[model samples]
Target: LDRALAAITRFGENANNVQNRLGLQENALAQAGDKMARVTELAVQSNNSSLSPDDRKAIASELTALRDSMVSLANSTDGTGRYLFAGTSDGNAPFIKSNGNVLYNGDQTQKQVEVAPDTFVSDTLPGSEIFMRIRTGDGSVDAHANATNTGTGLLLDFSRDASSGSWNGGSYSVQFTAADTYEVRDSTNALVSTGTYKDGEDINAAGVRMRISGAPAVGDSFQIGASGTKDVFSTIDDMVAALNSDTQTPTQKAAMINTLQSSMRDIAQASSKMIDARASGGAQLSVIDNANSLLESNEVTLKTTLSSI
Candidate 1:
């Protein structure tokens, strides 16, 4: 009954109320499509800044406009009053925004409903899976420290340095020269920062700080590159700031744009994943339709055979 309420169809005992529920679920997907379209428009609008901060900030309301739309759709519900993407927690909105943070209030599980004796369909996917969580970087280089590092070093919560001209393309590696010594070298192996590797000691390399917690070997290394997983909202918010804030000088803007371009690439990669995921959803929906037809055919066959008997 819960599966039927959540909306998925392949087989129907009556082939009954299942079809209408599935149709309603598809309508929810259409709502998500509109949300993404607004996001795309906001991204495009943020790209064209008026150069002057005042002119830029006043240039467009698309930034805040889409933001409202995005949140509203994330809370959309099916006619049954169940949230369309709240996983098993359909009673409440899956995403909540407070104090400038976007939070997922839904479970990570995708609800599954049996439509036939053996066939099943995914009734709903959690907002956490579809929205907040995403692939980072350009499918490869993510801007984060090594998770398996023996040392307790982590990335400082910050952005890359732009004014010094080494923020974007100047990727580098941090290798322990000794227990108390380390070296920072650019991609071309040029010296960037080389010194002691004291535990819990702050090492400023490239544009960010790396604090090693545990012992690092002679070859233990860390990397800082123009990559990493980021919330799509942060990417957009940052762009909106950069586009409209005239606080930075033209030279600063140029440098900022360099880093911004890299961030935009990451967002672009994430957006591609968004497209691919939705496409897969549609394809699976098609399969469900085929399965329903097959079940219908089997029912007719049994009726005809019974009539002959």
Candidate 2:
């Protein structure tokens, strides 16, 4: 009975305290999940075609604020000078907003909590997994102008046409056929567009209306391909820019609306992933709660039996 009581006092009671902290962690995870869902809904509302440019602009501000709220929760403090999810590095912020990007400074490693005797579980994930690394643009294409163009005063913007935007999902190249002539073609040598390449002329055809900064030289080729790391923050930022860009034609706006139609889908996917994490954390909390209850019961039984002995 003495042995039983000693074991209960040490390991079993430890489980109770650990379970308390795990429960807190679970609550924090749920809060984070709620933020994710809210932001996703905002992205959905932004996709509504009926919304004017004014409405879209207004939504960007709201979305930006929601993102700030998310980062604040993720970087919240513990009384012990640690953070809720600043795994392996409590001294630094887990998610930082800087340089037009959301940076994850935390390690991928998660904190471990011992809820049951000798049984440990990862209590929380780092910021990168939850927020910083969201897939951009349906993971379908990386539409951008090439970097090697010699044009001195050129600009380019890419937008997708949802209804009939074939603008396929691959690399496209624009090469100057002559000093004043440019041709847009895909990877298959298919002609996408042919247009005048003036210093201020816009490439306004074939599901895109991006411009060139300088007079492109003959054989100067600009290619638009897929980029894997556009990220959610950058996606919205680019969309905001697209909506506000004066050079953006009505045609560009149409394509942009189609492309942005996928924003909600991607944000929903991100929300779902965070929700799953919350579920997993909640499940562990349930286990911890049940185990703590059992431990307490056993603790009571051991105390009584030891006293009688």
Candidate 3:
């Protein structure tokens, strides 16, 4: 009976330790989510058509600071010396940013703690899973207007066609030949499709449909491709750069608007993922709570029976 009680005590300690780690993860995730939410808000504000170049520059400065904070948040630790998001390699930081690049130095492996007899739960998540891989757009495809285009065309809406067969993930360029006509070309510059462009008309480019309106010039182009994963840092960097760039031409202004919209979508996705991670930590913490309660009751019952005997 003494050994059984000791085992229960040990399990309780392990469960408590796991609970502490998960709590740390939840805190960091919440902080990260707040930062990203702010970023989304700033991006939306910068996209205001009436905002001047100086106004955008001010927003870009704030965005730069927020991106730096996000990097530090990704490298947060668990109050001790252990990095919370570093998987099993908890000694060092998980994210490394240099020369405008953010790299995940941690592995995908999660540290598991034995909270109960033969039952294990992961203490936290890896930095890569939380920060590195985020789907862009609608998870299948995304579109962006070229910054160098001379036209005033804007990407109003875009989506992947579910019934248009399999998307090859190929890059397709929609180039306008006239104000009313455009051609779709693959990555190799081979023409794939050509069609008339009417405002608010549904135009298909490589199985991805786009609703583009505005006066696009002859040399203007829009890129449509698979909705690949993008890291949070790169998305922020691109937004900052676009905000600081010169929007002298009609296409440049249009492209900046489109890019900012795309960045908001990406940031929203990242915020959603961070919320999910926090919820996961909350779930693990509750499991620990349940296990600890059961252990506490068992200890009371055992002590009472022993005293009675």
Candidate 4:
């Protein structure tokens, strides 16, 4: 019975430790969510057509500071100096930002703690899962202008056709042959569609619909690719670059607008992702609460039994 009581105490300690660590993580997650709210706000503010490059730069500066704060939160640690979101690799910081990119140095494995007899729960969640992996553009397709394009072509209302069964998942390109003529081609250089450019006219090809507005000079092109996963950091970095750009010409303005629109979608996604992480953290914290209650019951019953014995 004494040995049994000792085992219960040990498990209770593990439960306490796990609970504390999870609580810390919850706090950090909430703080990060607050920062992202401001980020989303700035993204929307920078999209105002009247805002000059200097005004956008002011917004970008604040966003840069917020991004730095989020990076700090991602590197949160426990009382023992172990990282909260580092998975099993808790000795060092999980997120490393270098050369304009945030990299995850943590492993995918989580450290589990025994909270009850024959029952275990993870003490931490992997930062890589929460920060590094998110699908772009409604989980099906993404559209963006080529960086080198010197045209005022703005791709608008880009989306995959939900009801179209003939849409092949291929990387498609929309290249302008003249100021008014455009060609849609697949990755193999096979022509998918060719038409005269009409501002705000829908361009339908390969299970997607988009409208190109503004004059696309010859050699200007846009890429429509299958959705790919991107990290939250890159999302912010892209927005910062977009906001701080020189959009003096009609062409430059179009490109910047495209980037701003893309950033808006990405920021929305990132905000929701943060909310999801907080929800999951709340669930884990609830599990810890249940385990603590069970531990208390066991401790009381053990004490009663020992007293009677």
TM-score each candidate.
Answer: 0.62, 0.63, 0.90, 0.91
Candidate 3 residue pairs that clash: none
Off by over 4 Å in 1: 1-10, 13-26, 29-31, 41-45, 48-50, 58-60, 142-223, 255-259, 298-309
Query: In model 2, which regions exceed 4 Å deviation?
Result: 1-18, 137-231
The number of the candidate with the highest TM-score is 4
The order of the candidates by TM-score, greatest first, is: 4, 3, 2, 1
* Regions more than 4 Å wrong, model 3: 1-6, 163-168, 187-191, 301-309
Tens digit of lDDT per residue, candidate 3, span 13-39? 888888887777778888888888898
TM-score of 2: 0.63
State each model's CA lDDT, in order.
0.59, 0.61, 0.83, 0.84
Model 1 lDDT per residue over 97-128, tens place: 87776778888787566665666666655666
**Cα deviation of 302, candidate 1, in Å:** 7.0
lDDT of 2 by residue, 124-221 (tens): 56656666666543344434334444443233344454533555556677788788888888778999768887665556545544556545557766
Off by over 4 Å in 4: 1-3, 163-166
Error of 4 at 305 (Å): 2.1
